[PDB]
């Protein structure tokens, strides 16, 4: 039960590193939705030269 | 950029 | 119109 307790603690600590590395990549998807708003700033720039 | 060329 | 276009393309 202590070899087993050393196993499931390591697997849960590895899963804890997942759940906080996923969130720092969810905070990266919140930047890819700004690379969207910059690709729409290129739509608005080609629409500025359109309108002008 | 095609609406620029087309509407010009 | 060209210079302000190239400033927004920049």
From Swiss-Prot, chain C:
Tissue: Highly expressed in fibroblasts, some expression in T- and B-lymphocytes, and little or no expression in Burkitt's lymphoma cell lines. Expressed in many hormone-independent mammary carcinoma cell lines.
Post-translational changes noted in the entry: One of the most prominent phosphoproteins in various cells of mesenchymal origin. Phosphorylation is enhanced during cell division, at which time vimentin filaments are significantly reorganized. Phosphorylation by PKN1 inhibits the formation of filaments. Phosphorylated by STK33. Phosphorylated on tyrosine residues by SRMS. O-glycosylated during cytokinesis at sites identical or close to phosphorylation sites, this interferes with the phosphorylation status.
Induction and repression of expression: Up-regulated by muramyl-dipeptide and lipopolysaccharide.
Domain of life the protein comes from: Eukaryota
Compartments reported by the entry: Cytoplasm; Cytoplasm, Cytoskeleton; Nucleus matrix; Cell membrane
Function: Vimentins are class-III intermediate filaments found in various non-epithelial cells, especially mesenchymal cells. Vimentin is attached to the nucleus, endoplasmic reticulum, and mitochondria, either laterally or terminally. Plays a role in cell directional movement, orientation, cell sheet organization and Golgi complex polarization at the cell migration front. Protects SCRIB from proteasomal degradation and facilitates its localization to intermediate filaments in a cell contact-mediated manner.
Subunit structure: Homomer assembled from elementary dimers. Identified in complexes that contain VIM, EZR, AHNAK, BFSP1, BFSP2, ANK2, PLEC, PRX and spectrin. Interacts with BCAS3. Interacts with LGSN. Interacts with SYNM. Interacts (via rod region) with PLEC (via CH 1 domain). Interacts with PLEC isoform 1C. Interacts with STK33. Interacts with LARP6. Interacts with RAB8B. Interacts with TOR1A; the interaction associates TOR1A with the cytoskeleton. Interacts with TOR1AIP1. Interacts with DIAPH1. Interacts with EPPK1; interaction is dependent of higher-order structure of intermediate filament.
Disorder: Cataract 30, multiple types: An opacification of the crystalline lens of the eye that frequently results in visual impairment or blindness. Opacities vary in morphology, are often confined to a portion of the lens, and may be static or progressive. In general, the more posteriorly located and dense an opacity, the greater the impact on visual function.
Record comment regarding domains: The central alpha-helical coiled-coil IF rod domain mediates elementary homodimerization.
Protein family membership: Belongs to the intermediate filament family.
Name of protein: Vimentin
Source organism per UniProt: Homo sapiens
Encoding gene per record: VIM
Full protein stretch here: 302 to 311 of 466
């Amino acid at each position: 039960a202590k070899q087993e307790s050393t196993e499931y603690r390591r697997q849960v600590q590895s899963l804890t590193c997942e759940v906080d590395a996923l969130k720092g990549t969810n905070e990266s998807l919140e930047r890819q939705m700004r690379e969207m708003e910059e690709n729409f700033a290129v739509e608005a720039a080609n629409y500025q030269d359109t309108i002008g | 950029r095609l609406q620029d060329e087309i509407q010009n | 119109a060209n210079r302000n276009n190239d400033a927004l393309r920049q």
